[PDB]
Write a protein that binds this ligand. Structure first.
Ligand SMILES: [Cl-]
Ligand SMILES: [Cl-]
Ligand SMILES: [Cl-]
Ligand SMILES: [Cl-]
Lengths: 215, 215
């Protein structure tokens, strides 16, 4: 296990290779480790609140129940990372790679996921209230029972995503691509959808969700 | 030309056959001629305000620019009648037969057309503001540029009707049959349509009218 003094001294010396390092429970609030290779690192329950991890490599890292509130993760590689129950509220994940990441039960309230890659990510039960996912790729993402209340999914790719059980009151889906997605009828009644791309079957479902009869 | 005294005396004697009679411009306000056969009669610009014409036969009658405001025409036969520019505001036309009638530019404000037959009727430019057409048959009716603002067309048959240019702000079309009708996209944005029956193409048009893209 590497401690705070050690990792900050190494980083100060210009070292960036921290792959597979054990940093469980470490206290790194307001720390900057931009560009660090933390691939496969164990950061379980780490406190990384307001840390600057811009452009860090965190692929397949264990970030389960980590505190990443307000952290900068712009253009970070979080592919296949374990972020179950992590606190990412108000984090900047703009342009981050989160494909196939485990974000189950994560706190993403007011998170910035603009232009992020969330292809096949597992967001089941995640809280995305007030989050911004403009231009994000959610192709095939699992949004089962997620909270999307007041979330901005404008211009987002939701093709083949599963939004079963998602809360969508106040959700903003203008210009989103919904083709092939699985959604509850209530989505058609709650989301703003101007410019949203749909299949014919979905357009019919939109009409049915407003009480029209096709018999 | 038969005058007021003559027709009322004849009716009082039990006469009901007034077919093809000339009654142009006659003043018959609050008169009762229930069950009278006035088929093919000339009632051009007659004043029949608040008259009781329940169950009258007025088939093919000339009622052009007649004042029928508040008149009772329940179960009256008005098939193919000329009612162009007639004033029928607040009239009771419940169960009347108006198929193929000319109602162009007619005033039907607050008229009761419940369960009336309006098959292939010409209602172009007619004013139906606040009218009640619950259960009416408007199969193939011409509603071009009609005013349907706040009109109740609940449970009405609108199959193959033409509503091009119709004003439909506040229109109430719950349970109406719209299949095959021609409508402007604005209808889908303005009418209440719970239970309204539509084709697949119409359901898609409903979605498109709310800004959804089918590309
Ligand atoms: Cl440093
Ligand atoms: Cl928006
Ligand atoms: Cl009498
Ligand atoms: Cl109603």
């Amino acid at each position: 296990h590497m401690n705070v003094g050690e990792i900050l001294r190494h980083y100060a010396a210009g070292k960036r290779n921290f792959q597979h390092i054990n940093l469980q429970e470490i206290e790194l609030t307001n720390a900057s480790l931009t560009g660090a290779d933390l691939s496969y690192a164990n950061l379980h329950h780490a406190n990384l609140s307001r840390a600057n991890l811009r452009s860090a490599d965190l692929r397949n890292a264990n970030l389960s129940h980590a505190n990443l509130s307000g952290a900068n993760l712009e253009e970070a590689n979080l592919e296949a990372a374990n972020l179950r129950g992590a606190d990412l509220h108000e984090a900047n994940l703009s342009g981050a790679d989160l494909q196939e990441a485990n974000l189950t039960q994560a706190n993403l309230k007011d998170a910035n996921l603009s232009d992020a890659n969330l292809e096949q990510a597992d967001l089941a039960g995640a809280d995305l209230q007030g989050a911004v996912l403009d231009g994000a790729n959610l192709h095939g993402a699992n949004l089962n029972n997620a909270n999307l209340s007041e979330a901005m999914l404008t211009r987002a790719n939701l093709e083949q995503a599963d939004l079963s059980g998602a809360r969508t009151t106040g959700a903003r889906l203008d210009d989103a691509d919904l083709r092939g997605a699985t959604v509850d009828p209530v989505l058609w009644r709650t989301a703003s959808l101007v410019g949203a791309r749909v299949d014919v079957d979905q357009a019919v479902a939109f009409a049915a969700a407003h009480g029209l009869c096709l018999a």
